[PDB]
Amino acid sequence: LYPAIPAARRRPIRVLSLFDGIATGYLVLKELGIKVGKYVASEVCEESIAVGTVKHEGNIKYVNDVRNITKKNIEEWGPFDLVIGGSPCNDLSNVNPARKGLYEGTGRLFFEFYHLLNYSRPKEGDDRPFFWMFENVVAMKVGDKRDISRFLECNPVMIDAIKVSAAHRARYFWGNLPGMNRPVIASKNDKLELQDCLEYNRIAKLKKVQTITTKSNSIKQGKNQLFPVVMNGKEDVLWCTELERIFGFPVHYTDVSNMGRGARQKLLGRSWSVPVIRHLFAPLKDYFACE
Amino acid sequence: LYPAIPAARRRPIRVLSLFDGIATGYLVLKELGIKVGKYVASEVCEESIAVGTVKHEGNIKYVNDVRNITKKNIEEWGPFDLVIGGSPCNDLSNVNPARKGLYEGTGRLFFEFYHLLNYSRPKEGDDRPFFWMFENVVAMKVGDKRDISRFLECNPVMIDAIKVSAAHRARYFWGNLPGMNRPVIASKNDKLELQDCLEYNRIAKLKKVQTITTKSNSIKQGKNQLFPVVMNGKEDVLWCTELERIFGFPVHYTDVSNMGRGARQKLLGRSWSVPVIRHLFAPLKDYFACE
Amino acid sequence: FETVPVWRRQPVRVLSLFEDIKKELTSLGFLESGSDPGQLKHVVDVTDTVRKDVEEWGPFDLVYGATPPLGHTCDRPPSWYLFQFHRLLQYARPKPGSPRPFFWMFVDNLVLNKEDLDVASRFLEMEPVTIPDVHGGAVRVWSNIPAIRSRHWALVSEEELSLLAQNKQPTKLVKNCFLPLREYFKYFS
Amino acid sequence: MFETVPVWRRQPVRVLSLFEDIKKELTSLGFLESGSDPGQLKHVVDVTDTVRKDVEEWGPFDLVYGATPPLGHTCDRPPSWYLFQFHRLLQYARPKPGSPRPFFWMFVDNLVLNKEDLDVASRFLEMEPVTIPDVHGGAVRVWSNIPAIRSRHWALVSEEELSLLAQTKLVKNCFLPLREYFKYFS
DNA sequence: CATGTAGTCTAATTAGACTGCATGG
DNA sequence: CATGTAGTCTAATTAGACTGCATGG
Ligand SMILES: Nc1ncnc2c1ncn2[C@@H]1O[C@H](CSCC[C@H](N)C(=O)O)[C@@H](O)[C@H]1O
Ligand SMILES: Nc1ncnc2c1ncn2[C@@H]1O[C@H](CSCC[C@H](N)C(=O)O)[C@@H](O)[C@H]1O
Ligand SMILES: [Mg+2]
Ligand SMILES: [Mg+2]
């Protein structure tokens, strides 16, 4: 679709990340070798911001609550080459019995992504490259999946992290990135089964775990709520460093701000699967500078 | 006092570590470039054992409670070239107003070190090399320091971690290691000021902090109990990755077993200052195989 | 937007959303009596309308938005009418080099609460204006129409409008809101 | 292997009495002459400041005795202190590995060591204690390497009886088996 | 017929002050 | 006068069942 760019005419990428979380988008782009010129992140969780500032050493400009970003800010902070974001799904996911849909609660924060996306879009007559991506859960109402597809004017592609990670994670992905519908392929450094993510002297009962949420009981597998690890002949839950390896994050990526077990699992449960985002951002290397 | 040994007759070191804790001794020896042929650790804390097994990938043989080690065990597991240990000081340090002294409570565990040391000592007529070391607090009754010196038949040299770390740690060191009374010198990799131990975007208020214990109030400095760090303009306590850098441990060394802020400070608070132990174990690499 | 001479004013091409204002615009003299092909189009449920639908319905000069006036028959959440009115508005806006005037307005009959209100101002880039008729002896309006943002209606106490809203449990008040559009388009009588 | 020694070769004892004086008790069995020769018995009440150089210069020892205070309540020190100090000097008094002569040691307890202190004592002294009844013919625990104090069958009494009893002729009969190894005096 | 980028409720748990004093500065 | 390889409490705080049902398998 978008015309190819000669290698010398490429310039560092300028990213606007809404609902940035623990800076998964920046981590992926830096691991791909893409030179990042600017990364504006909209996040309100102090512990999440702490991870992004410490692990990336202040290369990320945090711009608090997304609802306070004005049209002037998009022009001042811009222009942007990439606009990514994953809206909170605590009011959209089927796992919540009291979810409030897309138009109430935290589900309406999706329209903030739709709002600032049109602000960031190049004006009529600007044929410069521009990409965007939006991620959310699969387990949402058909009425919410329909309306989200209408505001973004495109249909999502479902990518499960089961193909590149050791965990179930089925997620929709709206966007216009190159080759999103392409077959997902596993990498050489992808830890595909649970035993690859565990520490020394720990045995994995299963090869692939169920979807990890912010709650500690999503670690207990199956209907009988089985502990997924055996250590020294005793059953045990997953460790924080093991949850990171499952998601593809670097080890000790959430060892920030004196966070404990429940705190680190809360940030990881919301996050993206790193090798899945790498699969989506991979064809961006032929449009921006490298290092 | 011991003659020098040529490089060819040097064999890997065999260590018996009583009250091993988080395996500071094995970490120091392996960080000096010494081949560790055998490292027998006597530890009863599950989280402490978990640190040693995971961070060292099972090169340490854990031999539970020291009071259950028999004379036949020392002969089977031996011979030992080095016997190190630091007994619990919760009944010896002045910080506890209810300490029971050396002959009651947990102070009795010192004699367990004295007992197994005699078992480990080479019989007369065996001029082979043999070294030992015992660490404890300086804030003990002079009657306790006296009696400890009588059973070990040696006087302690006091080394404060203030010279090599960013914290005050005044400790006694009984032993027969080569050059224990030599002047303590600072290395190039030693982080001497608190600012060298903090993360990005964090500011230190002091250059040195007071003695770190298992309590979270030893982080609050001074008689007014002031927070030692400022980030984003607000005050904050030290982080677990920062406590590790203060003690000289590798970063994320205690990021195991889903341990929180309190558990990691408990293990670090009663541990050894790594650069101090390196200063003591440094002249051992002229009697054993180098890596 | 400059003023247009009288011999050049084309008839309006309105798009009425959620509420039919054909009986209102015809009365004020904007639409034509004969029900020929051309005039406003009226849609109720836009959940399945795409950009191609709006574009092929002809270029529009006015895009109207309104919420049900205390209807109590809402299968839709209150904020749903605003977000959908936004999505279709950007489908109706022409090429950047606008030849002619392009107007839009959104009317709320005391349905959007405080939380929904600031969302409407952020997305429409404008704080609303209150037009009362309750005790002349009321609806909020977001609109880029100049004389609706220029002329100032009677100031209304906020503690009073919320008290008269639920104690009561839309055509003659916004008729003055449609008034200043006569200058830019044809006048029929 | 501490085999028996011919009678014409049995040198007199040289013992080390710690925390209690058993000279007046060892005299009665004729292990040492009443004539006050200097080297036969050494007695120290406070050990805190004694070093191996003191024990070695006090002449070699054939017997090392240990005893706790007998319910006298004159105890400035914890009950485990008497055991730990007794173990510290036994290694000072033990001779070179090659054994020229017999070496014996004994530690008795006058029911002042609780169960926690007992298993610590038997572990440092490398043997479980034997109990000698003296209170009710019609009692002390003894750790000792002397054979006939781990050989004969004394009155096997229970611990519930030892607990109720807590609420010198018998300890003189365990000094007797050292007579078949050293000089007899009358 | 097992599953889920969660919320409420309750019992464990744990984070913080309150304590404590011999002793070199 | 300030300091300390800590032990109590008490009070926040967290950690863990219970819930919940559309939906392809
Ligand atoms: N009003 C708001 N403005 C900006 N961020 C918000 C917000 N409300 C919620 N958020 C943040 O949006 C995030 C959505 S969870 C998604 C996190 C991110 N995609 C990741 O990879 O980790 C949450 O972390 C939440 O803290
Ligand atoms: N009875 C026992 N047997 C073996 N280890 C014991 C013990 N009682 C306590 N310990 C351990 O002895 C340790 C003393 S703290 C010293 C830790 C170690 N020197 C380090 O550098 O980290 C504690 O971790 C405690 O768990
Ligand atoms: Mg697509
Ligand atoms: Mg010395």
Numbering used by the authors:
A (entry chain A), B (entry chain D): 563 to 853
C (entry chain B): 179 to 315, 320 to 351, 360 to 379
D (entry chain C): 178 to 315, 320 to 348, 361 to 379
The authors write:
Mammalian DNA methylation patterns are mainly generated by two de novo DNA methyltransferases, DNMT3A and DNMT3B5. The catalytically inactive DNMT3-like protein (DNMT3L) has an important regulatory role in this process by acting as cofactor of DNMT3A or DNMT3B6–8. In addition to CpG methylation, DNMT3A and DNMT3B introduce non-CpG methylation (mainly CpA) in oocytes, embryonic stem (ES) cells, and neural cells. For simplification, we choose the DNMT3B–CGA complex for structural analysis, unless indicated otherwise. Similar to the DNMT3A–DNMT3L complexes, the DNMT3B–DNMT3L–DNA complex reveals a linear heterotetrameric arrangement of DNMT3L–DNMT3B–DNMT3B–DNMT3L.
To gain insight into the structural basis of DNMT3B-mediated CpA methylation, we also determined the crystal structure of DNMT3B–DNMT3L tetramer covalently bound to a DNA duplex containing two CAG motifs (DNMT3B–CAG complex). The structure of the DNMT3B–CAG complex resembles that of the DNMT3B–CpG complexes with subtle conformational differences: the replacement of the CpG dinucleotide with CpA leads to the loss of the base-specific contacts of N779 with the bases next to the methylation site, as well as a reduced packing between the A6 base and the catalytic loop. On the other hand, K777 forms a side-chain hydrogen bond with the N7 atom of G7, providing an explanation for DNMT3B’s preference for a G at the +1 site in the context of non-CpG DNA. A targeted activity analysis revealed that the preference of DNMT3B for a G at the +1 site is strongly enhanced in non-CpG methylation, but not that of DNMT3A. Strikingly, K777 undergoes significant side-chain conformational changes in response to changes in the major groove environments caused by different +1 bases, providing a mechanism for readout of +1 nucleotides by DNMT3B. This base shape-directed readout of the +1 flanking site by DNMT3B K777 on one hand may reduce the requirement for the N779-CpG contact when the CpG substrate is in a “favorable” flanking sequence context, on the other hand, shifts the preference of DNMT3B toward G at the +1 site on non-CpG substrates.
